[PDB]
Design a protein around this nucleic acid. Structure first.
Ligand code: CL
Ligand code: MG
Ligand code: MG
Ligand code: NA
Length: 328
DNA sequence: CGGCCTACG
DNA sequence: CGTAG
DNA sequence: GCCG
């Protein structure tokens, strides 16, 4: 009834089990903060199963046979159905460890390992970190200075204005190059944490060397508040206009050759869980190795040419899912 | 039990 | 180590 | 934590 991998079923952005999925995702996040990637995956997969259901779970019976629901995830759901809250989830939510790890890992330039080290050192607040800038990389300093703006969501209206400025710089860098909106906005989100763009050119090879030329032009326009600088991915903080002022926004820029564009579009459109599940499916069920550059057959030692995302789904034996149904 | 996505900066 | 989805 |  429900297939085991998230890439085998449609997952819409909005659904019928929001509260249940959110609670399981708290436990997934907390498992990640402890370095338990396997538990994180299970709770994420269980949450995503609920997103894919056609109606609300109202009774524990309805979990029977669903993939990724065993004793622990079922107990979480049971407690939410019976009491409206799950004690384990609420204990996580209130915990100093969870709240601090969440706050620190939200900083651009800080991952779980850094956050955990700071936690063990006794640090708890952003102002704790600011008082010890000797412990911070340039990237982390930028992430801390811009943290407040970066915590506020970007609107789709903002996205279109940003895309036109990126297109202007891209067109000067390489006439004929194109800019495609990817990430969560391509999946239909009305808001987001950042904006992701994929850049290519219809003539194979012309995109070589492009990203430095684009970044130099955006920096000369005064739009770049932070970037790391041959390269093909740039993780930036941009200046976005606002009434009478502006705000900082995270923008990711990625270049791919047109031969790789379908794979890069698929990868950068996400969701994160969808892509991990798709790569897992490819390797474990089909014996093929997937990344954002291509799809490799390791027995014939050949790469699959794709001209579209549709081609990639076909080559994996999966029903096509439009981006709006990849919200695993 | 092993496995859990797979890259680039 | 960070980043990405 | 769950699947195979
Ligand atoms: Cl684990
Ligand atoms: Mg994004
Ligand atoms: Mg991004
Ligand atoms: Na971070």
């Amino acid at each position: 009834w429900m297939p085991a991998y998230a890439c085998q079923r449609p997952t819409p952005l909005t659904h019928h089990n929001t509260g249940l999925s959110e609670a399981l995702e708290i436990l997934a996040e907390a498992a990640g903060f402890e370095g338990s990637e396997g538990r994180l995956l299970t709770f994420c997969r269980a949450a995503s199963v609920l997103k894919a259901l056609p109606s609300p779970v109202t009774t524990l019976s309805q979990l029977q046979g669903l993939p990724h629901f065993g004793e622990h995830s079922s107990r979480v759901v049971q407690e939410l159905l019976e009491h409206g809250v799950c004690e384990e989830v609420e204990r996580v939510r209130r915990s100093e460890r969870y709240q601090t790890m969440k706050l620190f890992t939200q900083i651009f330039g800080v991952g779980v390992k850094t956050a955990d080290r700071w936690y063990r050192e006794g640090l708890r607040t952003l102002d704790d970190l600011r008082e010890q800038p000797q412990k911070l990389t340039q990237q982390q300093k930028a992430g801390l200075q811009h943290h407040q703006d970066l915590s506020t969501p970007v609107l789709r209206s903002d996205v279109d204005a940003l895309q036109q400025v990126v297109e202007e710089a891209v067109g000067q860098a390489l006439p004929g190059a194109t800019v495609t909106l990817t990430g969560g906005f391509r999946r239909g989100k009305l808001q987001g944490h950042d904006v992701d763009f994929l850049i290519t050119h219809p003539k194979e090879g012309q995109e070589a060397g492009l990203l430095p030329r684009v970044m130099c032009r955006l920096q000369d326009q005064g739009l770049i508040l932070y970037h790391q600088h041959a390269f093909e991915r740039s993780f930036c903080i941009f200046r976005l206009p606002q009434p009478g002022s502006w705000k900082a926004v995270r923008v990711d820029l990625v270049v791919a050759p047109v031969s790789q564009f379908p794979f890069a579009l698929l990868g950068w459109t996400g969701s994160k869980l969808f892509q991990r599940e798709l790569r897992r499916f490819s390797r474990k069920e089909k014996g093929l190795w997937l990344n954002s550059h291509g799809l490799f057959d390791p027995e014939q030692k050949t790469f699959f040419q794709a001209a579209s995302e549709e081609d990639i789904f076909r080559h994996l034996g999966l029903e096509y899912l439009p981006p709006e149904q990849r919200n695993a």
